[PDB]
Amino acid sequence: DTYTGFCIIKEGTKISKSGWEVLSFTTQEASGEGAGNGLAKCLIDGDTETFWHAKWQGGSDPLPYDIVIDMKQNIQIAQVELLPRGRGSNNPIKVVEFAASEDNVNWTPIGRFGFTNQDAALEYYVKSIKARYIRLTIPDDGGNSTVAAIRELDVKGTIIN
Template sequence: MKKLLKLASLALLGLSLFTGCKKNEAPYEELTDAKDGASVYIARFTGNEQKLSIFPYQDEARTFEFGASFGALGLPKNNISVKYAVDDKAFDSLNVQRGKMGLTAYRKFPAEAYQISTLNSTISSGKTTSDLIKVSYFSRLFDPAFDYLLPISIVSADGYKIGTNKTIFLVAPKLSETPASKTGWTVSADSEELVGEGSVNGKATAALDGNIDTYWHSKWQGGELPFPHWLTIDMKQDIYVTRVELAARQNASTGFSRFNIEASNDGSTWISLGTGLIMDPANKAFQSFPVTPGYRRYLKITMTAGATSVTKSTHLAEINVYRY
């Protein structure tokens, strides 16, 4: 009998301790309308700009979502209405900081490039996060040469303190060009000098081998062929081309002086990317030629005039293609 009473006492003690623990946790779960020590802030705040995905371009809108969070001892007893606004003051302040660091100022999001689903959200009773705000944006409508900023701040929260992390900074970053890998590419030419320039030079493939000291040469043995001369590159897949670089032959200055660039996606139908472009055959550095950007598979370089009026054959050391 004494043993049973002892077991019952231990069980009651355990229940009492368990209940006591539950009571100690209760303040974090209790509903409260007290505003002291409570705040509302951006849920996805990181302290840094949120960089949006811009490339590859697409016709459909991309989206970014965020909301508000509630911080306090306990949970909100009533719904909290949170209001937001595009924050021009934060935009100006951040640009002042960038200026001090020698950085280019952000541009504002173009009005036609984005939509905000709503500037109101609700943290429901008993919850710690709000429903989400959706920012839709159209990547094609941002100039890839510039950085854009859209700051959105909490401006009111039903009388609750707004936390210092009240603003989300959405950035549409400028795009950086990178040289496209030439692995697997093929090249053809109107003619090649397969004998007179040695075992490597003279062939069209020398214009894509990554070596500026090798070169393609149009045929000259057995009689020079006149201008125009051309090289056609098959990149084997569509690449978003932004710029073409050409390097003249390093040990001669008798190349071409004018040329055209064309592009195709099927190898049959061509569009012009540049006409009457000027090449300096005496300049041994890479010479850069921005083109109308777009997805291209084939590029054609048509050389139309030589370094002198009597020049017939021509040559080229290397071709680089830049992309996003």
């Protein structure tokens, strides 16, 4: 079994998510926002203009919300970027959490970060690990609300296989 200690990690290249499969989400908006848009999957496409947004139209789901991605590949995760909705939007996400897994069974958390609905990308210095699965979670305990929206999720690191 492992432990958590310090590393020298280089700032890593983006891992370009052609392929990549959202394979479980708590909530998405299959209508309100576009139709083509709002889905969990809008999060790991190429498209900026397309964002994931929690269900709000005709119902909403209680927090917490999360999204598990298969990156189809073992990878040394170094950073995690979130392009927020920004553009003067009501996106009152105060806190986000990341975890990762090699199996999609035993999860290990790689940090809890503040969120800011800025237009630029949020660079998040996660605890690096070898992983194929990341789970973005919007926790039940942050001052987070049901309103939550994210244009893109990106993973900086190296490929290692």
